[PDB]
Amino acid sequence: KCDVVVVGGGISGMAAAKLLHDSGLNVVVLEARDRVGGRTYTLRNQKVKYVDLGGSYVGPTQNRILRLAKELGLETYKVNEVERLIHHVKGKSYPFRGPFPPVWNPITYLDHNNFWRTMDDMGREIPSDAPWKAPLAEEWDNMTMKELLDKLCWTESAKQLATLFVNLCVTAETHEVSALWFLWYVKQCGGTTRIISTTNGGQERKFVGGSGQVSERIMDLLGDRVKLERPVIYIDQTRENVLVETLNHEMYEAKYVISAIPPTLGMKIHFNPPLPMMRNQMITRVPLGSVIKCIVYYKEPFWRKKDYCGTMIIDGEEAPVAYTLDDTKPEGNYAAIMGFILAHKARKLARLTKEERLKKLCELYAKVLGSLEALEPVHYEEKNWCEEQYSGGCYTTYFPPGILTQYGRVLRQPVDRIYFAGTETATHWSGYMEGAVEAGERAAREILHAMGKIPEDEIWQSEPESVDVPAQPITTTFLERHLPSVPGLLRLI
Amino acid sequence: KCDVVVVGGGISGMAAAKLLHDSGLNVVVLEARDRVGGRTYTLRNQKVKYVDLGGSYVGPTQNRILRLAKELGLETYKVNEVERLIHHVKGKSYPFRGPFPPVWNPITYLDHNNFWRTMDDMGREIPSDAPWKAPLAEEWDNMTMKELLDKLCWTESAKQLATLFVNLCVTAETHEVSALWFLWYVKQCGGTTRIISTTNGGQERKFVGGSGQVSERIMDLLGDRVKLERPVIYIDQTRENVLVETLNHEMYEAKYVISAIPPTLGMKIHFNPPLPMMRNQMITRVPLGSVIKCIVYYKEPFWRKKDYCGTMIIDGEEAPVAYTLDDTKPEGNYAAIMGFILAHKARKLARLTKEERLKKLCELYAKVLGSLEALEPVHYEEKNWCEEQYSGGCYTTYFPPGILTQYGRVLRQPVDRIYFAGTETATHWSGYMEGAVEAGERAAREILHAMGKIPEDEIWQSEPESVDVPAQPITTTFLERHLPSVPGLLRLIGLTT
Ligand SMILES: *[C]C1=C([C])[C]=C2C(=[C]1)N([C][C]([O])[C]([O])[C]([O])[C]OP([O])(=O)OP([O])(=O)O[C][C]1O[C](N3[C]=NC4=C3N=[C]N=C4[N])[C]([O])[C]1[O])C1=NC(=O)[N]C(=O)C1=N2/[C]=[C]/[C]=[N+](\[C])[C][C]1[C][C][C]=[C][C]1
Ligand SMILES: *[C]C1=C([C])[C]=C2C(=[C]1)N([C][C]([O])[C]([O])[C]([O])[C]OP([O])(=O)OP([O])(=O)O[C][C]1O[C](N3[C]=NC4=C3N=[C]N=C4[N])[C]([O])[C]1[O])C1=NC(=O)[N]C(=O)C1=N2/[C]=[C]/[C]=[N+](\[C])[C][C]1[C][C][C]=[C][C]1
């Protein structure tokens, strides 16, 4: 028994556990599996030395995990983006530089340009704070991303790219998801460019040694306080001190509980009293994406000799993987290529043996890169989050049509003495590790204010720009921002 | 410890507990609350005598619950449909007879006609057995019912009626739901007419005294074997006998477990080993509807004197309730009007005090019936399932866009020795009580075949027509089935010639 019990073992949890504890409070972290990273997990073994099988990239805009990571003595390193990149469409590879693949036909350049531009216009109107307050909230929330794309794109080229863009960020199908939501999501990281970018944004760097380290080291900083194998089963706010209880068959009491489960996973616990109605149902409507992350390892980074860094953007159904990044260690060390198997594909491809899938991955790469070499892997590693009981799937939680709108404002409303962290709770970079920190921190601070050691003021707190990962702003073009849409051009005539 | 553990206390479970037990097997029903009715619950108290707060109607098509009901000595009674009915639109009531409200405008008579006609054409094409197998499964599954109506309906009159038709049957918004799914649902009951009808189909009869009876009585036939207050928390197939465990802190073991939790509510349990990928994620994408059931009681059934039985179909937002049935006991006894608060409205009006809601319903009724009398309730009763931890919501589970298609075929794939009941699992009338029976029974039988006391043959079993609720088929009209759509008419117009 203690002061405050935290229900998740992952980054948001620990971040929060620590904040509290750096603050004198007596904390305890109930964590359900033997490891402690979140959807964050770092394999270590001679063949690979280390690989993030969970989440790794981290960037310019993400001032907080950067910071936390530093305090625990960790270091960044940039991802390879020196050579050229590839957009392989209709069976051929086309190389290029810069964040964005070039388009040929004017009546298409116009389209694409409108597409993204429009995503951003549409977002500039959604408070991150609270998406459900947008002038057009409902209209956008009762529509599906596919609907939007269908309405928005006069060219197939664009319709597909956008699909992919989407398949790629969040984890599912243009048809699986609320427009209002997805629109929110992108903006809440600073829009298209920031998010899609390797170099001046989202996927610039990985952490030396693994993002796993983040939470392990906080565990180290915490005493015995972090209890592994402690699936929390049952929470009771009935009396005064709160009781939490473990599948284990032990009890803990405190005067507060932060929960860092991904929202759905709340169903995993039995509450008494019952949750208020909105929450109770909300927990039931907000699932997780599906993805298998895969890493194929070669003797050296053969791509570079062909003046490709290993970034492939790949169009089409026949392809197991649509996006690929270089995963070689910072030293020229373990040549590898990283790749995601998204959404429906993640479920189709699951049935194959690991082996069967490597063949597929390779063959693809050999073809896209154009090099027999890819046919000669030297080691493979993959994780399929789909199958994880205590995670539910990967990257994040998505919102289907009906929902942000109706159940949205509940996600982080406190229930008596339970407050709620978790990346899916953030406001910046939710969905990503940074999110997961802002969350926990904001949470815990909520509890502090409750206990009276701090004002409304200091629940929400600012993000001092890191010095190691400075951020430069986003640039537009008179042309880029006044060319007509395909319709405009039509009306112009 | 025992033979087979069943996880739900509701109709599917009991139905199934029984079947097994009628068969010599050593059963046990772990149920989580003090009661035992499903999303089936019967209030009892002088003011009311009894009222189903949960699910009550039952009808011509539903050959099994009728039957079980009978074996336990229960009796049907038809619901009032002698007087006329009302379609209240744009603020006026229009009375009528027959299951279907009449429409003025031909250019609209045609539309409606096509609307429903289309729903059935569209469903003659989806094997109930396995909806995901339709020639156009995907296309229809990545579409939302709102899209379909939008695409399908050339007239507001129709778009609105249809919307309501949906808000009503399932329990969500045209935009929350998969076309493919909803289509499936309707057809899996035998289509529009069967389903919408009071008299010759869906809502013909209530049981006397309450549906609750059904499951209680089985609990009676069952020994102590039914354990209330036993939230199952944890199920372990690791070894050989399976262990299930209660929040209570006691353990049962068996050689099979039937689960009768509505699917999502699986999450409620910790599995080891972990459920296979698909199931693990499916449990998570398939929620329930939202609805508050409401019953207002009057001195006598005043509407009848006005030659209305109290069936109100009510269009518009300004309305807390869109469908209303007479609930007066079969004797002329407790004058009452039943009504549903659907979908978004369920959540909007939830904030109001019970009181605030009564004023609202009444006022509503007073205007629609046109009768100061309704301003004079003599007692009120209401349930809001939205707030129920061990149910999730009401009538049933719905599938959003992505999903029947992908995670569908798992709903009832067994996992080692866990087999899966619950209405959400049926093939007929799923979503309804009948369903829940077909499920449970079929389930159990699945286990029988496992143990080798029965062949593949007898897992799925047929449905002998009730004598007391005989069923007559669905009737079409040369005209009904050849009038053009508003498009057809358009294309017909060929001034060219
Ligand atoms: C999975 C993943 C992947 C695969 C990938 C990725 C990721 C992921 N990410 C995301 C992250 O990870 C997130 O954000 C985080 O992690 C979250 O965290 P949190 O909040 O904490 O949650 P978690 O972590 O999970 O934790 C949880 C915990 O809890 C526990 N439990 C449960 N239940 C329970 C418990 N206990 C007791 N009782 C009970 N019941 C569990 O177990 C745990 O422990 C990401 N992120 C970042 O940042 N980075 C990266 O990299 C990532 N990744 C990704 C991304 C992708 N991208 C970027 C791509 C792209 C491209 C182009 C465009 C766009 C995008
Ligand atoms: C709710 C409802 C309402 C409100 C209404 C209705 C309904 C309902 N219904 C439906 C029914 O209810 C269903 O189907 C059934 O009941 C189901 O059952 P099952 O299968 O078994 O499931 P349940 O019952 O829920 O059971 C469950 C059990 O389990 C338990 N738990 C949980 N969790 C747990 C447990 N244990 C251990 N552990 C754990 N974890 C619980 O508690 C329980 O016990 C219906 N149906 C019929 O048949 N009828 C009727 O009436 C109904 N209702 C309605 C309907 C409506 N309508 C028809 C209307 C319309 C109009 C026009 C057109 C169409 C429609």
Query: For chain A, how big is the Rg over CA atoms in Å?
Result: 23
Q: Which amino acid is at A401?
A: P
**Burial per residue of A408-422, b for 16 or more beta-carbon CB atoms within 10 angstroms, e otherwise:** bebbbeebebbbbbb
Q: Which three-class secondary structure state does DSSP give residue A486?
A: helix
A252 and A291 fall within a common domain: no
In the reported structure, the alpha carbon of residue B459 is separated from the centroid of ligand 2 by a whole-number distance in angstroms of: 23
**Nearest chain B CA: its distance from A276 CA (Å):** 7
- Cα B114 from Cα B104, distance rounded (Å): 15
In the reported structure, the alpha carbon of residue B392 is separated from the centroid of ligand 2 by a whole-number distance in angstroms of: 10
B203 and B319 fall within a common domain: yes
In a domain, A254, yes or no: yes
Domain encompassing residue B90: 39-59+76-104+197-207+287-399
- Burial grade of B375 (CB within 10 A; 0-12, 13-18, 19 or more): exposed
Cβ–Cβ gap A267/B271 under 8 Å: no
A321 and A384 fall within a common domain: yes
Half-sphere exposure (CA, 13 Å, Cβ side) for B51?
25
Quote the Cα angle for A281-A286-A287, to 5°: 130
Q: Whose CA is nearest to atom 62 of ligand 1?
A: A196
Q: What is the dihedral of CA A459, A462, A466, A469, to 10 degrees?
A: 100
A276-to-A279, B34, B343, B382, B387 alpha-carbon distances in Å: 6, 20, 17, 17, 7
B146 and B111 fall within a common domain: yes
Q: CB of B330 closer than 6 A to ligand 2? A: no
Mutate to test the pocket of ligand 2, among B433, B437, B469 (most ligand atoms within 8 A of CB): B433
- Cα A319 from Cα A341, distance rounded (Å): 9
Which residues of B are less than 8 Å from A290 in CB distance? 281
B18 and B86 fall within a common domain: no
- Cα A349 from Cα A342, distance rounded (Å): 10
Question: Least CA distance to B402: which residue of chain A?
Answer: A176
Question: Least CA distance to B272: which residue of chain A?
Answer: A389
Which residues of B are less than 8 Å from A246 in CB distance? none
Among residues B471, B470, B468, B472, the alpha carbon closest in space to that of B71 is found at B468
- Cα B356 from Cα A296, distance rounded (Å): 64
Q: CB of B261 closer than 6 A to ligand 2? A: yes
Number of H helices, E strands in chain B: 15, 20
H-helix or E-strand spanning residue B258: strand B257-259
How was this structure determined? It was done by X-ray
Cβ–Cβ gap A280/B387 under 8 Å: yes
In a domain, B294, yes or no: yes
In a domain, B477, yes or no: no
Give the number of other CB atoms < 10 A from CB of residue B472: 8
Tokens matching residue B239? 């070894």
In a domain, A121, yes or no: yes
Cβ–Cβ gap B389/A172 under 8 Å: no
Q: CB of A212 closer than 6 A to ligand 1? A: no
The tally of domains found in chain A comes to: 3
Give the best residue of A33, A144, A145, A399 to mutate against chain B (max B CB count within 10 A). Answer: A144
- Cα A422 from Cα B336, distance rounded (Å): 48
Q: Which three-class secondary structure state does DSSP give residue A425?
A: helix
- The last residue of one of the domains, among B377, B399, B421, is B399
B91 and B188 fall within a common domain: no
- Cα B349 from Cα B357, distance rounded (Å): 7
Q: CB of B174 closer than 6 A to ligand 2? A: no
- The last residue of one of the domains, among B155, B171, B196, is B196
Report whether the peptide linkage leading into residue B273 is cis, meaning its omega lies within 30 degrees of zero: yes
Work out which ligand 1 atom sits closest to the CA atom of A394.
1
Cβ–Cβ gap A280/B231 under 8 Å: no
| Strands annotated E in A149-228 | 205-207, 226-227
A171 and A235 fall within a common domain: no
B377 contacts: CB under 8 Å, gap ≥ 6: B296, B297, B298, B358, B362
Percent of chain A that is helix, strand, coil (3-state, to 5): 40, 20, 45
Among residues A5, A11, A1, the alpha carbon closest in space to that of A424 is found at A11
Q: What's the CATH code of the domain at B328?
A: 3.90.660.10
- Cα A417 from Cα B302, distance rounded (Å): 50
B299 and B395 fall within a common domain: yes
In a domain, B470, yes or no: no
Contact A410, A403 (CB under 8 A): no
Among residues A2, A4, A15, A3, the alpha carbon closest in space to that of A425 is found at A15
Mutate to test the pocket of ligand 2, among B261, B382, B383 (most ligand atoms within 8 A of CB): B261
DSSP B303-315: GGGGTEEEEEEE-
**Burial per residue of B294-326, b for 16 or more beta-carbon CB atoms within 10 angstroms, e otherwise:** bbbbbeebbbbeeebbbbbbbbeeebbbbbbbb
This structure's resolution (Å) is 3.0
B214 and B156 fall within a common domain: no
Q: CB of B346 closer than 6 A to ligand 2? A: no
Work out which ligand 1 atom sits closest to the CA atom of A269.
40
Which residue of B234, B284, B402 is in closest CB contact with A175?
B402
Which residues of B are less than 8 Å from A389 in CB distance? 270-271, 274-275, 280
- Cα A462 from Cα A457, distance rounded (Å): 11
In a domain, B155, yes or no: yes
Q: CB of A59 closer than 6 A to ligand 1? A: no
Cβ–Cβ gap B281/A344 under 8 Å: no
Q: Which amino acid is at B44?
A: R
How many residues make up chain A in this entry?
493
- The last residue of one of the domains, among A382, A399, A416, is A399
Tokens matching residue A428? 């910046």
- Cα A466 from Cα A469, distance rounded (Å): 5
Q: How far is CA A390 from the centre of its chain?
A: 17
A64 and A90 fall within a common domain: no
Which residues of A are less than 8 Å from B403 in CB distance? 176
B259 contacts: CB under 8 Å, gap ≥ 6: B6, B7, B8, B266, B418, B419, B420, B421, B422
A248-to-A33, A310, B252, B254 alpha-carbon distances in Å: 12, 46, 17, 22
Q: CB of B56 closer than 6 A to ligand 2? A: yes
H-helix or E-strand spanning residue A167: helix A156-169
Contact B165, B171 (CB under 8 A): no
Torsion sign over Cα A352, A354, A356, A360: positive
In a domain, A234, yes or no: yes
Which residues of A are less than 8 Å from B392 in CB distance? 281, 284
Q: What's the CATH code of the domain at B148?
A: 1.10.405.10
Which residue of B142, B264, B280 is in closest CB contact with A175?
B142
Quote the Cα angle for A284-A288-A294, to 5°: 160
In the reported structure, the alpha carbon of residue B221 is separated from the centroid of ligand 2 by a whole-number distance in angstroms of: 22
B97 and B124 fall within a common domain: no
**Burial per residue of A261-293, b for 16 or more beta-carbon CB atoms within 10 angstroms, e otherwise:** bbbbbbbbbbbeeebebbbbbbbbbbbbbbbbb
A297 and A378 fall within a common domain: yes
Cβ–Cβ gap A386/B280 under 8 Å: yes
Q: What's the CATH code of the domain at B34?
A: 3.50.50.60
In a domain, A47, yes or no: yes
- Which ligand number lies closest to the CA of residue B11? 2
Q: CB of B17 closer than 6 A to ligand 2? A: no
A394-to-A170, A286, B192 alpha-carbon distances in Å: 9, 13, 40
